């Protein structure tokens, strides 16, 4: 647990890349398509990808991204606190 | 920028950390031109009749004249512009002005003029203090590297040097009040839009830049064969260039033709 | 979900690949069947001879009988290794140069390095961590000391001689003739004899004995390893025999088995070995023994590499060269560049293109039959069970429809033979392999794929006729026109893959190159 | 010997789908061996 | 032999169980999968201590299937013998080749070559047993067996023991 | 259809690892292999009906691992080992042993 | 473990999750049976408390009149706590109950104190708690580790005292 | 700029051939991928060379997920937000 960086000493970008966005959407779409509970008010949609986008819009995806520094340490960022451009 | 073993190839990608598709050709206006044109364009003086602001441009033009703090700020700005001219002429010894850079400031200013229906026939409600402080703060709010020790600070200033030079070149006080005639609302809008469009041009970690660079270099190499022999049209210029020259550069041949 | 079976061993991922070399002890311990006969299959011509090349303990490739060692079908048996014992040690064709180089750098009698810590140049060489340069420098330095020094001047005082235990004998000069390593002794001029270097072919067993006598400090200094890479192992004594998976037999009919080249070469190796053995115990003259050893060395050398410089090529009975192991891996079509970096795939199509001005920018027209052949494994959930049920009822001969139904347990029901298009009731977690339907992402490309923008994603629209459809503005990134060009279509098979094709490679996102 | 574990009918009726690399029982449609 | 050890396990939770009650599902999965199992590295898994004090680790969603894998550490009481161990046990079945003794959850077999000749097989007795001058061994008779070897598979461990020396048999 | 080297390079340029892995292994040739945890070789004999796992050379019946690799990689490793070279596969957490 | 060959997996010094060295813990039939019974009844009490949260009799289980009543309570406990899916646990518990030398906690504590007062190895102590030997030499032969380590008079005294401590059924 | 920096990063001019890149310190399978396969394999065996399986080629040979873009990070579950709902 020595690798983990304290929240105050986080020196990575506070925006989320396109790769992280695509990975998160894919994971959430798979979990929804495997009958996982939905955290938002579904309105007439039957596609897991669109419901994943909808959950992302209200920032309700309960996932955490771990970013690997080259030496081996890592930095943990919640999906709620990552700024997504539109 | 590193490799599979962890060896650093570049301490920053591209030396400024910018994506290759967020970069357009823009002209640095400080380099070229004679000293008289530079002095007329960028110098403003509140005590000499030669270089005063016409009071019909600034809403508070009558009262500001003769002040002391304002001329000190303008003098600092002009010293900065002079140092920028010296540095830019040190870098590009050829004197060329058009280089690729992020953010098209001209289009942002044109959009501000078109959206707010700015009428040039009326005085503007801007303040010299506000213009200078706003430009300096916007420079303070441009970030590519977010370290905390002095090394990262130096690296980040080195990265953003040239863009700060262009930004100072376009947003000079006389240019704002006399050439654009922006109001306070349009000025705030321009500053916010510039910061937002800059922050979206940084390169995304995870990008495989090696294969991108290799493909970029070696795609025109395929078409290079056709026009290699144009120098073959000059018999007395039998100098290797084209496919064989690139081959010799890559092989690091010890016996050139 | 690979193997169609269950095992309790945990799943893990490879992190390191530590290379090395077999010791003969390892070859013996690993092997399960000491091959003994130059024949494969019995005199009844119905079963393989036990102890032959096709011993059942190694395994079988056929789909009826199972392996004797593990009792598993041909789709689960990896294969097990045999071994063959050699009468006399044989040089390995891939380390002759290294053997000679390390032989010239070590005394032929005392089995020790010609230098030690006293010399400054040895300190410089031992200061280098890079093994390759270290060995190269040590070789180019110590190739010129033909006599071992008994006493060396002391570092503190050049007038003081310290004995290093050297034998003081004279080392030869070694040259290579074909597969033979011939030495020449240049006797000292003070001996009174002429300066005629006596020539002799060095015996492999003597060289093996010399190498076995080297120590650990010299192990590290030369650039070898104690556990994995001893030099004594560079000379062959036992030859491992690969299982029949590596050399599969192609059977046209019940009694028509065409065997691989590798098994023919191995049979010849064993035949020569038994001939040399039966001449060895019969008290034959030394000339015949030398000739038989040369033949054995030739066969073993050309079994692995068949392109050796300065030798004839081992030919087949029809005149073609024998495809050795090296020729399997070295080519462009070999394993590395033909079966591990690029390979043929499933769920793909290839067809000519055409132009459609009514299609949107990022939409591709897919023919009907190509849409009826490729599929997608959709998961049955509360939101789709009605449409999926109607799709299953439709069957496989109608678009839209389905072609297979996978249960929770991994079993897969072919909808065509099972009358149960109108019978199967679907549950939560089952999978329907349905046809590709409008607005499904696909990957689309043209060869050669020179740059990033030549492989892009698209949304499907099912159309009649046999061509693909494209918008007339994407033909520039593809460098493609419509006078006969064919392009390739690849279908993703998951949700993560679909999201990657829709958020990364889409045509809208590839406009500013 | 290859038999369907659900029909339990002897002798088993089996059809090989070569173009799909499958072995299929001709009664329940179950897929027995692949590739 | 009963001992306390520290154990860990990797448990995969299906995506359909992703809710606020995930800890309960993990606890049920652990209790239902681990208790009563046998591992050749640690013998039979008899019991798990401090059920309320189960240690947990953050999930790591697998990139291939979406099932969340968790690493769970705990302390457990387990049973495992060693070479040369002597254990009391209960006779299970009687045969001419020897006998079988249940000790804990395991079986140790003894072959007729591994007992002194004074013990003779009586088949006419009900049940058939081994009779000697002093010791009589039969069903439900406490018998001490010196375990000589053990064979470990995925789900069980068999043992072979000998009583060839003195002070062995009925107690 | 051939998914060549140029295609692999283009997919690396885009940055889609999952598509690459699915195309390479799940769509062409996936194989499951038991490897020894001590010598790191493919010599382990497994009787799956009786779940009997044995390493003959090292006398191992506990440390045995399941790995998912292509089939051509297994062929390459066997052909390498048929010439007295040892490609010894190891696991991340095998340094403890 | 004739020569106390416990291996790495069962070393005398154990490294716990807290990282501190501890003496290896060995329990005989009585100690293990009492521990597992206590754990099972505690788990049952926790389950009942949880059920009451979502929405007296336990004193009779621990105090058993007879072996048969104890076995019936054990069966009820397994039905209400285990689910009946674990036959090996039932067999182990039956083996513990049928051949438990000591039923009361205080007597088991007395046996532990008597065996570990001399400071013998935990393996030997657990073996002595599991095995009842009439003579010291019988135990010494059946426990080769006890040879050369304990005086015969002390072993005889311990064995006689343990035999006296056995509660009559 | 990247190509030039790669070509002159080892203190000297390293040509883009086998002599320059296939004689580097990189992984064995990576180097044997092109034009000198069997000899590099022989040398790696004889010197007991250790491969680390971190480059693209080593993760393509073994059929795994290379750390390339979407594969450069790990996705993990946050229990706090899940319980909070």
From Swiss-Prot, chain C:
Positions of the UniProt region annotated as Rudder loop: 306-323
Location(s) in or outside the cell: Nucleus
Residues annotated for Mg(2+) 1 binding in this entry: 481, 483, 485
Region (Lid loop): 248-260
Residues annotated for Zn(2+) 2 binding in this entry: 107, 110, 148, 167
Post-translational modification remark: The tandem 7 residues repeats in the C-terminal domain (CTD) can be highly phosphorylated. The phosphorylation activates Pol II. Phosphorylation occurs mainly at residues 'Ser-2' and 'Ser-5' of the heptapeptide repeat. The phosphorylated form of Pol II appears to carry, on average, one phosphate per repeat. The phosphorylation state is believed to result from the balanced action of site-specific CTD kinases and phosphatases, and a 'CTD code' that specifies the position of Pol II within the transcription cycle has been proposed.
Binding-site residues for Mg(2+) 2, renumbered to this chain: 481, 483
Residues that coordinate or bind Zn(2+) 1: 67, 70, 77, 80
Family: Belongs to the RNA polymerase beta' chain family.
Function: DNA-dependent RNA polymerase catalyzes the transcription of DNA into RNA using the four ribonucleoside triphosphates as substrates. Largest and catalytic component of RNA polymerase II which synthesizes mRNA precursors and many functional non-coding RNAs. Forms the polymerase active center together with the second largest subunit. Pol II is the central component of the basal RNA polymerase II transcription machinery. During a transcription cycle, Pol II, general transcription factors and the Mediator complex assemble as the preinitiation complex (PIC) at the promoter.
Encoding gene per record: RPO21
Curated annotation (Swiss-Prot), chain D:
Binding site for Zn(2+): 4, 7, 25, 28
Zinc finger (TFIIB-type): 1-33
Protein location: Nucleus
Family statement drawn from the similarity comment of this UniProt entry: Belongs to the TFIIB family.
Quaternary structure, from the entry: Associates with TFIID-IIA (DA complex) to form TFIID-IIA-IIB (DAB-complex) which is then recognized by polymerase II.
Misc. comment: Present with 6750 molecules/cell in log phase SD medium.
The protein's role, per its UniProt record: General factor that plays a major role in the activation of eukaryotic genes transcribed by RNA polymerase II.
Name of this protein: Transcription initiation factor IIB
The organism of origin for this protein: Saccharomyces cerevisiae (strain ATCC 204508 / S288c) (Baker's yeast)
High-level lineage: Eukaryota, Fungi, Dikarya, Ascomycota, Saccharomycotina
Gene transcribed to yield this protein: SUA7
Curated annotation (Swiss-Prot), chain E:
Subcellular location: Nucleus; Cytoplasm; Cytoplasm, P-body
Molecular functions (GO terms): single-stranded DNA binding; single-stranded RNA binding; translation initiation factor binding
GO terms under cellular component: cytoplasm; nucleus; P-body; RNA polymerase II, core complex; RPB4-RPB7 complex
Main location: nucleus
Annotated GO biological process: DNA-templated transcription initiation; nuclear-transcribed mRNA catabolic process; nuclear-transcribed mRNA catabolic process, deadenylation-dependent decay; positive regulation of nuclear-transcribed mRNA poly(A) tail shortening; positive regulation of translational initiation; RNA-templated transcription; transcription by RNA polymerase II; transcription elongation by RNA polymerase II
Any one Pfam family match given in the protein's UniProt record, by short name: SHS2_Rpb7-N
Keywords: Cytoplasm, DNA-directed RNA polymerase, Nucleus, Transcription
Tree of life domain: Eukaryota
Transmembrane segments: none
Subunit structure: Component of the RNA polymerase II (Pol II) complex consisting of 12 subunits. RPB4 and RPB7 form a subcomplex that protrudes from the 10-subunit Pol II core complex. The RPB4-RPB7 subcomplex probably associates with TFG1. Interacts with NRD1 and PAT1.
Note: Present with 6420 molecules/cell in log phase SD medium.
Protein family membership: Belongs to the eukaryotic RPB7/RPC8 RNA polymerase subunit family.
Protein name (database record): DNA-directed RNA polymerase II subunit RPB7
Biological source species: Saccharomyces cerevisiae (strain ATCC 204508 / S288c) (Baker's yeast)
Curated annotation (Swiss-Prot), chain G:
Protein's cellular compartments: Nucleus; Cytoplasm; Cytoplasm, P-body
Keyword Acetylation listed: yes
Bias type Basic residues, positions: 48-55
GO terms for MF: nucleotide binding; translation initiation factor binding
GO CC terms of this entry: cytoplasm; nucleus; P-body; RNA polymerase II, core complex; RPB4-RPB7 complex
GO BP term (any one): nuclear-transcribed mRNA catabolic process, deadenylation-dependent decay
Key words of the record: Acetylation, Cytoplasm, DNA-directed RNA polymerase, mRNA processing, Nucleus, Phosphoprotein, Transcription
Gene3D superfamilies: 1.20.1250.40
Main localization (coarse): nucleus
Pfam families hit by this protein: RNA_pol_Rpb4 (PF03874)
SMART domains linked: RPOL4c (SM00657)
Subunit structure of this chain's protein: Component of the RNA polymerase II (Pol II) complex consisting of 12 subunits. RPB4 and RPB7 form a dissociable subcomplex associated with the 10-subunit Pol II core complex. In exponentially proliferating cells, only approximately 20 % of the Pol II complexes contain the RPB4-RPB7 subcomplex. In starving cells, that enter stationary phase, RPB4-RPB7 is associated with Pol II in a stoechiometric manner. The RPB4-RPB7 subcomplex probably associates with TFG1. Interacts with LSM2 and PAT1.
Name listed for the protein in its UniProt record: DNA-directed RNA polymerase II subunit RPB4
Lineage, broadest ranks: Eukaryota, Fungi, Dikarya, Ascomycota, Saccharomycotina
């Amino acid at each position: 647990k020595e690798k983990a960086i304290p929240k105050d000493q986080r020196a990575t970008t506070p925006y989320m890349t396109k790769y992280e966005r695509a990975r998160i959407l894919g994971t959430r779409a798979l979990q929804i398509s495997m009958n996982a509970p939905v955290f938002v008010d579904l309105e007439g949609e039957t596609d897991p990808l669109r419901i994943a986008m909808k959950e992302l819009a209200e920032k309700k995806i309960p996932l955490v991204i771990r970013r690997y520094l080259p030496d081996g340490s890592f930095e943990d960022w919640s999906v709620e606190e990552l700024i997504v451009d539109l | 920028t590193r490799n599979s073993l962890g060896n650093v190839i570049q301490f920053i990608y591209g030396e400024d950390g910018m994506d290759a598709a967020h970069i357009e050709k823009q002209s640095l206006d400080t380099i070229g031109g004679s000293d008289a044109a530079f002095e007329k364009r960028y110098r403003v003086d509140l005590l000499n009749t030669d270089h005063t602001l016409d009071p019909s441009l600034l809403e508070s033009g009558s009262e500001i004249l003769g002040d002391l703090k304002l001329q000190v700020l303008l003098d600092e700005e002009y010293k900065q512009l002079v140092k920028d001219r010296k540095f830019l002429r040190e870098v590009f010894v050829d004197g060329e002005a058009n280089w690729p850079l992020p953010v098209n400031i001209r289009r942002i200013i044109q959009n501000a003029q078109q959206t707010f229906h700015i009428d040039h026939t009326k005085p503007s409600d801007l303040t010299i203090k506000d213009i200078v402080l706003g430009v300096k703060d916007l420079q303070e709010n441009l970030l590519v590297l977010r370290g905390k020790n002095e090394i990262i600070q130096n690296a980040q200033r080195d990265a953003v040097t040239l863009f700060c030079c262009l930004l100072r070149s376009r947003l000079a006080t006389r240019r704002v009040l006399q050439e654009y005639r922006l109001t306070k609302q349009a000025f705030d809008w321009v500053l916010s839009n510039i910061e937002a469009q800059f922050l979206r041009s940084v390169v995304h970690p995870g990008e495989m830049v090696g294969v991108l660079a290799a493909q970029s270099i070696g795609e025109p190499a395929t078409q290079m064969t056709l026009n290699t022999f144009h120098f073959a049209g000059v018999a007395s210029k039998k100098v290797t260039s084209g496919v064989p020259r690139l081959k010799e550069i890559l092989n690091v041949a010890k016996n050139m033709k | 979900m690979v193997g169609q079976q269950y095992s309790s061993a945990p799943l893990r991922t490879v992190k390191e690949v530590q290379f090395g070399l077999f010791s003969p002890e390892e070859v013996r311990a690993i092997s399960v069947a000491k091959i003994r006969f130059p024949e494969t299959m019995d005199e009844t011509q119905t079963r393989a001879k036990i102890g032959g090349l096709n011993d059942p303990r190694l395994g079988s490739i056929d789909r009826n009988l199972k392996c004797q060692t593990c009792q598993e079908g041909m789709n689960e048996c990896p294969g097990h290794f045999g071994h063959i014992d050699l009468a006399k040690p044989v040089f390995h064709v891939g380390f002759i140069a290294k053997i000679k180089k390390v032989c010239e750098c070590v005394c032929m009698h005392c089995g020790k390095l010609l230098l030690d810590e006293h010399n400054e140049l040895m300190r410089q060489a031992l200061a280098i961590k890079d093994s390759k340069k270290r060995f190269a420098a040590i070789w180019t330095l110590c190739k010129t000391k033909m006599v071992c020094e008994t006493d060396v001047p002391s570092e503190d005082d050049p007038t003081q001689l310290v004995s290093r235990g050297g034998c003081g004998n004279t080392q030869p000069t070694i040259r290579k003739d074909g597969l033979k390593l011939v030495g020449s002794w240049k006797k000292d001029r003070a001996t009174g004899d002429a300066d005629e270097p006596e020539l002799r072919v060095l015996s492999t067993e003597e060289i093996l004995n010399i190498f076995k006598h080297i120590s650990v400090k010299d192990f590290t200094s030369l650039g070898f390893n104690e556990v994995f890479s001893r030099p004594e192992w560079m000379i062959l004594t036992c030859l491992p025999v690969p299982p029949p998976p590596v050399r599969p037999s192609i059977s046209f009919n019940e009694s028509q088995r065409g065997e691989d080249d590798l098994t023919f070469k191995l049979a010849d190796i064993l035949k020569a070995n038994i001939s040399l053995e039966t001449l060895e115990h019969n008290g034959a003259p030394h000339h015949a023994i030398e000739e038989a050893e040369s033949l054995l060395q030739f066969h073993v050398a050309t079994y692995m590499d068949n392109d050796i410089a300065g030798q004839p090529q081992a030919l087949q009975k029809s005149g073609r060269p024998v495809k050795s192991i090296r020729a399997r891996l070295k080519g462009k079509e070999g394993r590395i560049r033909g079966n591990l970096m690029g390979k043929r795939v499933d769920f793909s199509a290839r067809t000519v293109i055409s132009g459609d001005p009514n299609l949107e920018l990022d939409q591709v027209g897919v023919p009907k039959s190509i849409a009826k052949t490729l599929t997608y494994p959709e998961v049955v959930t509360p939101y789709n069970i009605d449409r999926l049920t109607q799709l299953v009822r439709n069957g496989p001969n109608e678009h839209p429809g389905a072609k297979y139904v996978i249960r929770d347990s991994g079993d897969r029901i072919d909808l065509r033979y099972s009358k149960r298009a109108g019978d199967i009731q679907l549950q939560y977690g089952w999978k329907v392999e349905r046809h590709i339907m409008d607005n499904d992402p696909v990957l689309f490309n043209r060869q050669p794929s020179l740059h990033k923008m030549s492989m892009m994603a698209h949304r499907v629209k099912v159309i009649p006729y046999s061509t693909f459809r494209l918008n007339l503005s994407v033909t520039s990134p593809y460098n493609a026109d419509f006078d006969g060009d064919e392009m390739n279509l690849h279908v993703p098979q998951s949700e993560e893959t679909r999201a990657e094709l829709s958020q990364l490679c889409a045509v809208p996102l590839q406009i500013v190159s | 010997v290859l038999t369907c574990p659900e029909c339990k009918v002897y002798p088993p009726k089996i059809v090989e789908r070569f173009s799909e690399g499958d072995v299929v029982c001709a009664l329940c449609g179950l897929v027995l061996s692949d590739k | 032999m009963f001992f306390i050890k520290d154990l860990s396990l990797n448990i995969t939770l299906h995506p359909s169980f992703f809710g606020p009650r995930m800890k309960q599902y993990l606890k049920t999965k652990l209790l239902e999968e681990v208790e009563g199992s046998c591992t050749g590295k640690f013998g039979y898994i008899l019991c798990v201590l401090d059920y309320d004090n189960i240690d947990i680790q953050r999930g790591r969603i697998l990139p291939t299937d979406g099932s969340a894998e968790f690493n769970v550490k705990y302390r457990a009481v387990v049973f495992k013998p060693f070479k040369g161990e002597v254990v009391d046990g209960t006779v299970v079945s009687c045969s001419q080749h020897g006998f079988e003794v249940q000790v804990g959850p395991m079986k140790v077999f003894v072959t007729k070559h591994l007992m002194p000749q004074d013990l003779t097989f009586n088949a006419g007795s009900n049940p058939p047993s081994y009779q000697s001058s002093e010791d009589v061994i039969t069903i439900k008779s406490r018998i001490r067996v010196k375990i000589e070897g053990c064979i470990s598979q995925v789900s069980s461990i068999h043992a072979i023991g000998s009583i060839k020396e003195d002070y062995l048999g009925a107690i | 259809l051939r998914f060549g080297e140029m295609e692999r390079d283009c997919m690396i340029a885009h940055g889609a690892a999952s598509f690459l892995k699915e195309r390479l292994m799940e769509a062409s040739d996936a194989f499951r292999v038991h490897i020894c945890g001590i010598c790191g070789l493919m010599t382990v004999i497994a009787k799956l009906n009786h779940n009997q796992f044995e390493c003959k050379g090292c006398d191992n019946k506990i440390d045995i691992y399941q790995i998912h690799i292509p089939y051509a990689a297994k062929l390459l490793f066997q052909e390498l080992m048929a010439m007295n070279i040892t490609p010894r596969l190891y696991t991340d957490r095998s340094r403890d042993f | 473990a004739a020569t106390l060959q416990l291996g790495q997996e069962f070393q005398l010094k154990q490294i716990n999750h807290q990282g501190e060295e501890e003496e290896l813990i060995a329990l005989n039939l009585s100690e293990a049976r009492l521990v597992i019974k206590e754990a099972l009844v505690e788990r049952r009490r926790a389950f009942k408390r949880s059920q009451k949260k979502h929405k007296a009799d336990d004193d009779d289980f621990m105090h058993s009149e007879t072996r048969e009543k104890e076995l019936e309570s054990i069966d009820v406990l397994l039905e209400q706590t285990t689910g009946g899916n674990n036959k090996d646990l039932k067999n182990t518990m039956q083996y513990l109950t049928n051949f438990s030398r000591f039923r009361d906690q205080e007597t088991v504590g007395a046996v532990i104190q008597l065996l570990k007062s001399t400071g013998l190895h935990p393996f030997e102590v657990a073996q002595l708690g599991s095995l009842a030997c009439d003579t010291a030499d019988e135990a010494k032969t059946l426990i080769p580790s006890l040879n050369n380590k304990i005086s015969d008079d002390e072993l005889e005294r311990i064995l006689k005292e343990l035999s006296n401590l056995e509660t009559l059924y | 700029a990247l190509l030039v920096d790669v070509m002159t990063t080892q203190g000297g001019l390293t040509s883009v051939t086998r002599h320059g890149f296939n004689r580097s310190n990189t992984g064995a399978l990576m180097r044997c991928s092109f034009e000198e396969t069997v000899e590099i394999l022989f040398e790696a065996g004889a010197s007991a060379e250790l491969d680390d399986c971190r480059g693209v080629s080593e993760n393509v040979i073994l059929g795994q997920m290379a750390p390339i873009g979407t594969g450069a990070f790990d996705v993990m579950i946050d229990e706090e937000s899940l319980v909070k709902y």
